[PDB]
Design an enzyme around this catalytic site. Structure first.
Site, PDB file in Angstrom:
ATOM      1  N   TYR A 193       0.711  -1.107  -0.188  1.00 22.52           N
ATOM      2  CA  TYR A 193       0.044   0.145  -0.436  1.00 22.52           C
ATOM      3  C   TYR A 193       0.625   0.947  -0.370  1.00 22.52           C
ATOM      4  O   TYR A 193      -0.184   2.723  -0.075  1.00 22.52           O
ATOM      5  CB  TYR A 193      -1.237   0.557   1.433  1.00 22.52           C
ATOM      6  N   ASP A 211      -5.216   4.209  -0.635  1.00 25.36           N
ATOM      7  CA  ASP A 211      -5.609   3.443  -2.141  1.00 25.36           C
ATOM      8  C   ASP A 211      -7.261   4.590  -1.648  1.00 25.36           C
ATOM      9  O   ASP A 211      -8.559   4.191  -2.634  1.00 25.36           O
ATOM     10  CB  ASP A 211      -5.956   1.729  -2.034  1.00 25.36           C
ATOM     11  N   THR A 254     -24.742  -3.869   6.163  1.00 30.56           N
ATOM     12  CA  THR A 254     -24.109  -4.921   7.102  1.00 30.56           C
ATOM     13  C   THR A 254     -23.155  -5.018   7.899  1.00 30.56           C
ATOM     14  O   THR A 254     -21.611  -5.278   8.057  1.00 30.56           O
ATOM     15  CB  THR A 254     -22.706  -5.506   5.527  1.00 30.56           C
ATOM     16  N   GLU A 293     -14.518  -1.672  11.214  1.00 34.26           N
ATOM     17  CA  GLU A 293     -15.574  -1.041  10.561  1.00 34.26           C
ATOM     18  C   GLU A 293     -16.980  -1.787  11.422  1.00 34.26           C
ATOM     19  O   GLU A 293     -17.734  -0.591  11.174  1.00 34.26           O
ATOM     20  CB  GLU A 293     -16.080  -0.871   8.882  1.00 34.26           C
TER      21      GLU A 293
HETATM   22  O1  UDP Z   1      -1.698  -4.609   3.045  1.00 36.80           O
HETATM   23  C1  UDP Z   1      -2.332  -3.828   3.186  1.00 36.80           C
HETATM   24  C2  UDP Z   1      -4.145  -3.651   3.692  1.00 36.80           C
HETATM   25  C3  UDP Z   1      -4.330  -2.106   4.137  1.00 36.80           C
HETATM   26  N1  UDP Z   1      -3.550  -1.646   4.813  1.00 36.80           N
HETATM   27  C4  UDP Z   1      -4.350   0.142   4.974  1.00 36.80           C
HETATM   28  O2  UDP Z   1      -5.589  -0.024   5.898  1.00 36.80           O
HETATM   29  C5  UDP Z   1      -6.400   0.401   4.708  1.00 36.80           C
HETATM   30  C6  UDP Z   1      -6.935  -1.394   4.465  1.00 36.80           C
HETATM   31  O3  UDP Z   1      -8.639  -1.803   3.699  1.00 36.80           O
HETATM   32  P1  UDP Z   1      -8.104  -1.724   2.038  1.00 36.80           P
HETATM   33  O4  UDP Z   1      -8.138  -0.371   1.607  1.00 36.80           O
HETATM   34  O5  UDP Z   1      -7.875  -2.694   1.294  1.00 36.80           O
HETATM   35  O6  UDP Z   1     -10.217  -2.155   1.823  1.00 36.80           O
HETATM   36  P2  UDP Z   1     -10.930  -1.820   2.233  1.00 36.80           P
HETATM   37  O7  UDP Z   1     -11.043  -0.660   2.596  1.00 36.80           O
HETATM   38  O8  UDP Z   1     -11.503  -0.797   0.374  1.00 36.80           O
HETATM   39  O9  UDP Z   1     -12.313  -2.793   1.749  1.00 36.80           O
HETATM   40  C7  UDP Z   1      -6.316   0.911   3.157  1.00 36.80           C
HETATM   41  O10 UDP Z   1      -5.906   1.334   3.107  1.00 36.80           O
HETATM   42  C8  UDP Z   1      -4.667   0.862   3.882  1.00 36.80           C
HETATM   43  O11 UDP Z   1      -4.562   2.081   4.307  1.00 36.80           O
HETATM   44  C9  UDP Z   1      -2.371  -1.664   4.012  1.00 36.80           C
HETATM   45  O12 UDP Z   1      -1.856  -0.622   4.212  1.00 36.80           O
HETATM   46  N2  UDP Z   1      -1.693  -2.302   3.560  1.00 36.80           N
HETATM   47 MN    MN Z   2      -9.682   1.209   1.081  1.00 39.00          MN
END
Ligand code: UDP
Ligand code: MN
EC number: 2.4.1.40
Length: 276
Positions: free
Chosen positions: A65, A144, A176, A234
């Protein structure tokens, strides 16, 4: 103490004309729901600048990330709290992979190395004293992402959550939430105001530490009980914001995925968006 606003010339608010008629702009506990057209940003900028407000922004960039940091920071420079003091806190396992991003005046970035959802713990007990000393508000976001439009002081308040873009039109039974009574994050089908996204929450330092402390404790209890909430951090955030109502709620303008969800009429701006 708060000094007088200066003289300002702007359109008179009209009591018998709502800003927005298509959307709910205040919650039943009287917290503003922040949509484009509901706020005069000049008035708000004045209020917060007069307080010399400093906004901390936390972001985790672990393993792969770190790749998202350049775009995230460059666009934050264009759109996030411009004119105000900002302190970015980048938590990473790879301090050397943090990109050199050029920052505007009054803005700073700190790299915080962590070990090679733990975000709640890291925000709460480890960084507690520092945040209280350095910033007035904390904003906690996913990395991201990119800013595409204004994200400013209209969001600041003791405690805020953001409407999840997949659920803002959904009935509570469709949310959810964690549905097992064995979890600390449990919420039954007849409860719930909104489904808040884990990717964008914040408030005053004090309220954010409270939240992250509470969620960290609830997660630990769940772990000891051999259970992991369906949507992790969440799920716990949703339970917290159910029992501790936020003082503002951000519309899905503030957390959108255009690839997944397009650009509906109800969104006048797409401010902060998923990166594919
Ligand atoms: O290997 C990882 C996985 C998660 N993250 C952090 O934790 C958030 C994890 O949620 P992710 O964005 O992967 O899934 P989402 O929230 O979009 O469903 C990311 O934005 C990163 O800030 C990270 O830094 N490395
Ligand atoms: Mn995310």
């Amino acid at each position: 103490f708060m000094v007088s606003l200066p003289r300002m010339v702007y359109p008179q608010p009209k009591v018998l004309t709502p800003c927005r008629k298509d959307v709910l702009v205040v919650t039943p506990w009287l917290a503003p729901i922040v949509w484009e057209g509901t706020f005069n940003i000049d008035i708000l900028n004045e209020q917060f600048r007069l307080q010399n407000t400093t906004i901390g922004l936390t972001v985790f960039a672990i393993k792969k990330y770190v790749a998202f940091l350049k775009l995230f920071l460059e666009t934050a420079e264009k759109h996030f709290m411009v004119g105000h003091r900002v302190h970015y806190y980048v938590f990473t396992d790879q301090p050397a992979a943090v990109p050199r991003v050029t920052l505007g005046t009054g803005r700073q970035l700190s790299v915080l190395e962590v070990g090679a959802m733990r975000r709640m713990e890291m925000i709460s007990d480890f960084c507690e004293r520092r945040f209280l000393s350095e910033v007035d508000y904390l904003v906690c976001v996913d990395v991201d992402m990119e800013f595409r439009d204004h994200v400013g002081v209209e969001i600041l308040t003791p405690l805020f959550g953001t409407l999840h873009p997949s659920f803002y039109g959904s009935s509570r039974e469709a949310f959810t939430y964690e549905r097992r009574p064995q979890s600390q994050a449990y919420i039954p089908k007849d409860e719930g105001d909104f489904y808040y996204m884990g990717a964008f929450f914040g408030g005053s330092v004090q309220e954010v530490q409270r939240l992250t402390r509470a969620c960290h404790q609830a997660m630990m209890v769940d772990q000891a009980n051999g259970i992991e909430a369906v949507w992790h951090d969440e799920s716990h955030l949703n339970k917290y914001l159910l029992r501790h109502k936020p003082t503002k709620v951000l519309s899905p303008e503030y957390l959108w995925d255009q690839q997944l969800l397009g650009w509906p009429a109800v969104l006048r701006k797409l401010r902060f968006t998923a990166v594919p």
